[PDB]
Design a protein around this motif. Sequence first.
Motif, short mmCIF file in Angstrom:
data_model
loop_
_atom_site.label_atom_id
_atom_site.label_comp_id
_atom_site.label_asym_id
_atom_site.label_seq_id
_atom_site.Cartn_x
_atom_site.Cartn_y
_atom_site.Cartn_z
N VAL A 1 -28.05 26.06 13.08
CA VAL A 1 -26.93 25.92 12.08
C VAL A 1 -27.15 27.08 11.14
N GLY A 2 -25.99 27.41 10.51
CA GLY A 2 -25.78 28.50 9.48
C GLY A 2 -25.25 28.10 8.20
N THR A 3 -25.13 29.00 7.31
CA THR A 3 -24.39 29.05 5.97
C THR A 3 -22.96 28.63 5.98
N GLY A 4 -22.38 29.09 7.32
CA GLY A 4 -21.00 29.13 7.27
C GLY A 4 -20.61 30.29 6.14
N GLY A 5 -19.12 30.35 6.02
CA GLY A 5 -18.79 31.27 5.12
C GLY A 5 -18.49 32.81 5.64
N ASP A 6 -18.63 33.03 7.00
CA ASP A 6 -18.43 34.29 7.35
C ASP A 6 -17.25 34.80 7.36
N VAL B 1 -14.99 29.94 17.26
CA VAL B 1 -15.42 28.76 17.87
C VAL B 1 -16.77 28.49 17.28
N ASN B 2 -17.11 26.89 17.43
CA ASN B 2 -18.44 26.51 16.75
C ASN B 2 -19.77 26.91 17.63
N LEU B 3 -19.95 28.05 17.36
CA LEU B 3 -21.25 28.81 18.25
C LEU B 3 -22.33 28.10 18.21
N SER B 4 -22.75 27.60 16.87
CA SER B 4 -23.99 26.62 16.53
C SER B 4 -24.15 25.44 17.18
N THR B 5 -22.96 24.59 17.04
CA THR B 5 -22.65 23.53 17.65
C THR B 5 -22.84 23.33 19.18
N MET B 6 -21.89 24.43 19.94
CA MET B 6 -22.22 24.55 21.43
C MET B 6 -23.64 24.71 21.67
N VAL C 1 -32.63 18.49 16.26
CA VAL C 1 -31.91 17.57 15.48
C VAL C 1 -31.14 18.62 14.40
N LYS C 2 -30.12 18.47 14.64
CA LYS C 2 -28.96 19.52 13.87
C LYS C 2 -28.49 18.74 12.56
N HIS C 3 -28.50 19.70 11.66
CA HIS C 3 -27.91 19.34 10.23
C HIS C 3 -26.74 20.17 10.21
N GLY C 4 -25.60 19.75 9.68
CA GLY C 4 -24.38 20.07 9.41
C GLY C 4 -23.40 19.71 8.61
N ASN C 5 -22.00 20.00 8.29
CA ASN C 5 -21.09 19.71 7.34
C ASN C 5 -19.67 19.92 8.08
N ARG C 6 -18.75 19.12 7.36
CA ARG C 6 -17.19 19.84 7.56
C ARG C 6 -16.99 21.14 7.51
N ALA C 7 -15.89 21.64 7.64
CA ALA C 7 -15.47 23.02 7.46
C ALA C 7 -15.28 23.19 5.79
N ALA C 8 -15.70 24.41 5.27
CA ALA C 8 -15.41 24.53 3.80
C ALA C 8 -14.34 25.71 3.68
N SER C 9 -14.64 26.89 4.56
CA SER C 9 -13.61 27.45 4.56
C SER C 9 -12.92 27.87 5.83
N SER C 10 -13.49 27.49 6.81
CA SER C 10 -13.04 27.65 8.36
C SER C 10 -12.09 26.87 8.88
N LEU C 11 -11.56 26.87 10.15
CA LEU C 11 -10.32 25.77 10.36
C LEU C 11 -11.05 24.67 10.73
N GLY D 1 -15.38 23.14 11.38
CA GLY D 1 -16.64 23.16 11.31
C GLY D 1 -17.29 22.46 12.31
N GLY D 2 -18.53 22.52 12.39
CA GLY D 2 -19.53 21.82 13.30
C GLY D 2 -18.97 20.37 13.64
N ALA D 3 -19.29 19.68 12.30
CA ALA D 3 -18.95 18.43 12.11
C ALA D 3 -17.61 17.85 12.62
N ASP E 1 -22.39 34.61 11.01
CA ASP E 1 -23.51 33.86 10.97
C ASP E 1 -24.13 33.36 12.12
N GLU E 2 -24.29 34.19 13.21
CA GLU E 2 -24.55 33.86 14.48
C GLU E 2 -25.22 35.20 15.20
N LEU E 3 -25.87 35.04 16.17
CA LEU E 3 -26.11 35.95 17.10
C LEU E 3 -24.81 36.49 17.67
O1 LIG Z 1 -16.29 26.77 6.92
P1 LIG Z 1 -17.23 27.62 6.88
O2 LIG Z 1 -17.99 27.68 5.31
O3 LIG Z 1 -17.32 29.20 7.40
O4 LIG Z 1 -18.82 26.95 7.64
C1 LIG Z 1 -18.57 26.83 9.12
C2 LIG Z 1 -19.59 25.58 9.58
O5 LIG Z 1 -20.63 26.38 9.94
C3 LIG Z 1 -21.64 25.87 9.47
O6 LIG Z 1 -22.35 24.78 10.45
P2 LIG Z 1 -22.60 25.32 11.90
O7 LIG Z 1 -23.48 26.63 11.77
O8 LIG Z 1 -23.34 24.08 12.47
O9 LIG Z 1 -21.18 25.18 12.63
P3 LIG Z 1 -20.69 26.36 13.77
O10 LIG Z 1 -20.70 25.08 15.16
O11 LIG Z 1 -19.36 26.06 13.68
O12 LIG Z 1 -21.50 27.18 13.87
C4 LIG Z 1 -21.03 24.58 8.28
O13 LIG Z 1 -21.82 23.52 8.15
C5 LIG Z 1 -19.61 24.46 8.71
O14 LIG Z 1 -19.46 23.31 9.83
#
Ligand SMILES: O=P(O)(O)OC[C@H]1O[C@H](OP(=O)(O)OP(=O)(O)O)[C@H](O)[C@@H]1O
Lengths: 347, 349
Positions: free
Chosen positions: B84-89, B94-99, B112-122, B124-126, B229-231
């Motif tokens: 999981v990442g902070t997001g906000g990059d 594509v949802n690299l963490s979730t994949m 055991v994955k923690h996550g949330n809906r999109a904040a700024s992206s189109l 999010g993982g959720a 916010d990924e490799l």
């Molecule tokens: O909208 P953003 O602020 O840029 O954040 C994008 C997503 O990244 C984080 O999760 P996660 O790393 O699990 O999602 P990913 O599968 O998209 O990498 C965060 O919980 C959002 O779901």
Amino acid sequence: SVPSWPQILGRLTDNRDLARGQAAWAMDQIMTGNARPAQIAAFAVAMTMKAPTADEVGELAGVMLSHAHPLPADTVPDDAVDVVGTGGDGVNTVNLSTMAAIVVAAAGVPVVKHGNRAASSLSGGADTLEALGVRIDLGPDLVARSLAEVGIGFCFAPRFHPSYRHAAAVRREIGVPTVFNLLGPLTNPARPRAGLIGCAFADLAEVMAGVFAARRSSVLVVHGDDGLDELTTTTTSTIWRVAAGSVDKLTFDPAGFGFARAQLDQLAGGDAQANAAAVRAVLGGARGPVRDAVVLNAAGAIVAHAGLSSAEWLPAWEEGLRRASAAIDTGAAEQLLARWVRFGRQI
Amino acid sequence: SVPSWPQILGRLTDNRDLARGQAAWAMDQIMTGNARPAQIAAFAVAMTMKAPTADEVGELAGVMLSHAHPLPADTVPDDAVDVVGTGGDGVNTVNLSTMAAIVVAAAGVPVVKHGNRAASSLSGGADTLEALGVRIDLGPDLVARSLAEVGIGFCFAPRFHPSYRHAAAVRREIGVPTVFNLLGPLTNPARPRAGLIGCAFADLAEVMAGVFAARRSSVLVVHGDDGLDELTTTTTSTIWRVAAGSVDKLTFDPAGFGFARAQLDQLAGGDAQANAAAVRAVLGGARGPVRDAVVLNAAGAIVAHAGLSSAEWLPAWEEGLRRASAAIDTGAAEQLLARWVRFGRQILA
Ligand SMILES: O=P(O)(O)OC[C@H]1O[C@H](OP(=O)(O)OP(=O)(O)O)[C@H](O)[C@@H]1O
Ligand SMILES: O=P(O)(O)OC[C@H]1O[C@H](OP(=O)(O)OP(=O)(O)O)[C@H](O)[C@@H]1O
Ligand SMILES: Nc1cc(F)ccc1C(=O)O
Ligand SMILES: Nc1cc(F)ccc1C(=O)O
Ligand SMILES: Nc1cc(F)ccc1C(=O)O
Ligand SMILES: Nc1cc(F)ccc1C(=O)O
Ligand SMILES: [Mg+2]
Ligand SMILES: [Mg+2]
Ligand SMILES: [Mg+2]
Ligand SMILES: [Mg+2]
């Protein structure tokens, strides 16, 4: 291109100066009740930690004035003076600006003073005035009348700046001083062109001076080198002297005028009743460190006034000190306070 | 003592590190609903501009965790991992963490994955998981069952951290990234001891690493040198490796393993439906830039998992990549997603 909170807050947290108009946009959002308390607080804090510029604070103060109740047209003399500080110096002193302001008016200089109740001290200028029987609740017309009939008028900030209520609530909730603490002294609604302006925060006094410089005011922005937002008697003071659109920073030493060094505890104050008693003592002619500080600050405001229709620095100080002391010693200051109290009771 | 907003905010505006306990007091006010929105925002901003320390953030995260819903006792494997990442990059991916999480789980590592809906992206993982038909709304008992029966569970942050809601609202109101953006990755309520943790902001990655170091977690905190916010596969990445309670910083080059340099545009995402289609293509075995990025990140998580039991760096990566590839090519990853979806559908009845 289009302003918004994320854009402006991001620029500040990135430690960058705002683009022209952005501070004004934020302030107008705040003054019209359109800003969330969270956005107000984030802006106030981020601007403080970035280090605000004179241009930015000029925008804040200018927007705030645009929403203020003005005084009626042609009721403020061209050479009126203010005497007021940020407060927040953290030292419980007697009300030096408010006492100086009475002495200055009694010396024959028109005074239109801005002020407010205490924020962190035991008694602010407005609390002390109230305890003395002076009306602090007067609106634009009655302040203009006070000025014409008594030679002094007091503008109570909350009465003249109602739209600032959202920012003021946030200041109280967060407590920490911010750039917003600069705004009271910058926003006298009568807009006098001269002033003695105290700044508790040494790092922001130059910014306050820069704001006055763009108004072509004649102002002394002052900071006691012991931390007071007044000219001090305990040590030197830094003065940012503003005239003709420029600033002349200098170190000021009252020992050059024969003042004895005092200790801060000799300037200590109490509640409104106590500080009101201290006003009467000084105006009655009691000698000592409190009088000395009052005369010093009153003379400073007279020097600022002299800067309008313009004496050189030293002769202006000598004359300011003569007039301030004489206004006390001849009873003029005592008499003027009595006259001010009567005026308020005859309404 | 005694702590107060003027005290703590004044210390921060003076550009001073807080005293021990002050961050925790601030977070307690926030989590109990006693902090005014203005106080929450002032604190978030002031801590960010001062530059938070790992001790300060550890206090925030520890207080936050104390108010979270925990998973039932003895339901999280010792060797569970988060991705999981902070997001906000601000890069549309594509949802690299979730994949990667699905692939890691299918390789036999409990996730055991923690996550949330999109904040700024189109999406999010959720959002993407929801589009795939995976139930994102499960409480502690059912996430625990998911982990047992499927090998992966998803903890939806608003479900597990209801007392963070005042802080979350302030985050949205001010829009600007703060120290609070670090808290999601640090507050997985299942408390896995290993993870692959993405940082949108290089300047704070070290603080993130330090918090994991204080916990003696085995973690790779990562930031792509292209901003991800990924490799990343478009260039090198910075990795702060957390092992044995200490952190070390590394430059990582995927070219060392035979990865071709991709272009950021090749990883572009869309809405939840589109990103769900991208997950399906990858799990079906389609080759190319998206698979490459997933495999790389999945291997990273498997490396972090391996660090729970001492494997040299390079062999760990080799085995990680091989394990990630096999999980896809055996069909196991596609089968795991299907099992996960099936599990959620079983809940009714
Ligand atoms: O909208 P953003 O602020 O840029 O954040 C994008 C997503 O990244 C984080 O999760 P996660 O790393 O699990 O999602 P990913 O599968 O998209 O990498 C965060 O919980 C959002 O779901
Ligand atoms: O409580 P504080 O935040 O420290 O502020 C003390 C006073 O200083 C300012 O006015 P002014 O300079 O007119 O008051 P004075 O007569 O006490 O100097 C402010 O409006 C307060 O009334
Ligand atoms: N409305 C205000 C204006 C000021 F200048 C200072 C304080 C208040 C207030 O509402 O407290
Ligand atoms: N400090 C102040 C000085 C003024 F002249 C008016 C208002 C205030 C205030 O801080 O509310
Ligand atoms: N309650 C929450 C907890 C989180 F971790 C993130 C967001 C919220 C929210 O209330 O939006
Ligand atoms: N970025 C996040 C990562 C998580 F694991 C949980 C929550 C968030 C969020 O920023 O709300
Ligand atoms: Mg004063
Ligand atoms: Mg003062
Ligand atoms: Mg991610
Ligand atoms: Mg990402």
